[PDB]
Amino acid sequence: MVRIDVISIFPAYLDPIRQGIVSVEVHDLRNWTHDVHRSVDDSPYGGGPGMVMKAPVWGEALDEICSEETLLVVPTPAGRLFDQRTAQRWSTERHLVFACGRYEGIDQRVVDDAARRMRVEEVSIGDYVLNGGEAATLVMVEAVVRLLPDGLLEGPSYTRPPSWRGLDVPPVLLSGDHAKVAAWRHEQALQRTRERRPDLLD
Amino acid sequence: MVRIDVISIFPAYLDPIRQGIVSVEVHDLRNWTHDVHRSVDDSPYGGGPGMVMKAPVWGEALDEICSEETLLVVPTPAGRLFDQRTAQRWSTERHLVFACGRYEGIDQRVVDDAARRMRVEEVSIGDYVLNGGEAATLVMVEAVVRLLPDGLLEGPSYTRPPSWRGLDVPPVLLSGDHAKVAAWRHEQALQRTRERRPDLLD
Numbered sequence: 170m171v172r173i174d175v176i177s178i179f180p181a182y183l184d185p186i187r188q189g190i191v192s193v194e195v196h197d198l199r200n201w202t203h204d205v206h207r208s209v210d211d212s213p214y215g216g217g218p219g220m221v222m223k224a225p226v227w228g229e230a231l232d233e234i235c236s237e238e239t240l241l242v243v244p245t246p247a248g249r250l251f252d253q254r255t256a257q258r259w260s261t262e263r264h265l266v267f268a269c270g271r272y273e274g275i276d277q278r279v280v281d282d283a284a285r286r287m288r289v290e291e292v293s294i295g296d297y298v299l300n301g302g303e304a305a306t307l308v309m310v311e312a313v314v315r316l317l318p319d320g321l322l323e324g325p326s327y328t329r330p331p332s333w334r335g336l337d338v339p340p341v342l343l344s345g346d347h348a349k350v351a352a353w354r355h356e357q358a359l360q361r362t363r364e365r366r367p368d369l370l371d
Numbered sequence: 372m373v374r375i376d377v378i379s380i381f382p383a384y385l386d387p388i389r390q391g392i393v394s395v396e397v398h399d400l401r402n403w404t405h406d407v408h409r410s411v412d413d414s415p416y417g418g419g420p421g422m423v424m425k426a427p428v429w430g431e432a433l434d435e436i437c438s439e440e441t442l443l444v445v446p447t448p449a450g451r452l453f454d455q456r457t458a459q460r461w462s463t464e465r466h467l468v469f470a471c472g473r474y475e476g477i478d479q480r481v482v483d484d485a486a487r488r489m490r491v492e493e494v495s496i497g498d499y500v501l502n503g504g505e506a507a508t509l510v511m512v513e514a515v516v517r518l519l520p521d522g523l524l525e526g527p528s529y530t531r532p533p534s535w536r537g538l539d540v541p542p543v544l545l546s547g548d549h550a551k552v553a554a555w556r557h558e559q560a561l562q563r564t565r566e567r568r569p570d571l572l573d
């Protein structure tokens with residue numbers, strides 16, 4: 170079984186995450202604060218464009234939630250790119266903890282302290298900016314959980330009816346020789362990949 | 372104002388999307404079915420590993436929801452990569468419709484028919500596989516809405532206290548000359564980018 174914990178100051182954003190193999194629990198980071206303000210952020214050392222999430226609150230939360238078996242994931246635009254191989258690799262883990270940042274991110278010493286006792290991966294889901302780690306956590310959790318018990322883009326798929334609004338299903342798919350269908354699909358996959366993702370051809 | 376419509380067979384997955392500039396409405400695709408089964412999928416022409424979403428249900432839904440001003444987004448792993456420039460560009464639109472696929476995706480003629488009357492972008496959020504377009508829609512909507520009224524990864528940030536669990540904030544950030552802080556941050560950004568995203572240096 171894989172146990173998944175998510176820590177966030179917007180726990181309700183993880184509501185879709187529910188939709189004996191996997192367990193999910195979402196925690197409010199403000200539960201490990203001790204001040205009337207329930208403060209989780211503070212001013213950046215060196216100056217900066219926003220606030221930074223405090224280390225003591227995070228360390229206290231991670232002390233309670235994680236153990237030596239934990240793989241701690243920190244969603245961040247400064248991370249390694251999430252990919253299918255990463256999702257497969259994480260699917261074998263027994264305990265994933267997703268630490269969701271907001272503001273400008275989490276004080277670096279949270280990760281440095283955690284790495285003393287567990288494994289930690291900082292991961293971006295793509296080259297675009299979100300407000301927080303929660304949506305990235307939804308994507309990574311879904312990608313992983315769907316893996317529990319070539320290199321061309323996929324081309325177009327069709328289903329019935331054979332004609333719809335003057336647009337016909339390509340005849341080779343209707344008149345089906347397996348070899349001809351595969352050939353047609355490979356050509357479509359290659360053209361699509363050239364058009365949309367030339368990086369995948371180098 | 373930007374009006375955002377999402378169409379999905381799992382409308383509840385778009386619940387976080389709520390958290391005079393932007394309007395969001397989620398629709399159940401099965402509302403445009405007419406059979407007792409509320410069927411939205413059918414067998415792939417040419418053979419295939421799964422079912423394909425029917426065109427007539429989608430065209431009927433898109434007839435009701437879209438107009439000539441609409442930019443229709445189809446989340447798909449076969450799409451162009453979503454990026455920050457795309458999110459900025461979409462933030463200027465007046466009407467975004469997100470067509471969420473499941474199973475093996477949507478019959479290609481849905482996109483071909485829609486492109487007769489509107490603009491259509493097929494977009495992937497990254498090189499990993501989800502079950503459906505709904506989580507990708509959460510990411511793209513968040514990236515866009517946060518834009519409404521260099522090229523190195525960001526390095527580490529710190530906030531108080533200056534020492535925590537034997538880990539000190541780097542002294543240059545505490546003893547702050549603006550030029551020295553910027554220099555230190557540029558070096559950290561460069562090393563981090565080399566380590567985690569060498570593709571960004573080519």
Ligand SMILES: Nc1ncnc2c1ncn2[C@@H]1O[C@H](CSCC[C@H](N)C(=O)O)[C@@H](O)[C@H]1O
Nearest residue numbers: 244245270274293294298299300301302305
């Ligand atoms: N592409 C991405 N992948 C993973 N997490 C991301 C992400 N984009 C943003 N995040 C999450 O969002 C948090 C804040 S990033 C946004 C910072 C702030 N709004 C600003 O002025 O830019 C990060 O710490 C990370 O947890």
Ligand SMILES: Nc1ncnc2c1ncn2[C@@H]1O[C@H](CSCC[C@H](N)C(=O)O)[C@@H](O)[C@H]1O
Nearest residue numbers: 446447472476495496500501502503504507
């Ligand atoms: N990286 C990505 N970016 C955008 N949409 C994606 C995506 N990965 C999956 N999707 C969405 O998920 C839908 C089904 S893809 C999964 C297909 C099926 N479960 C299988 O056997 O592989 C796509 O049509 C698209 O809407």
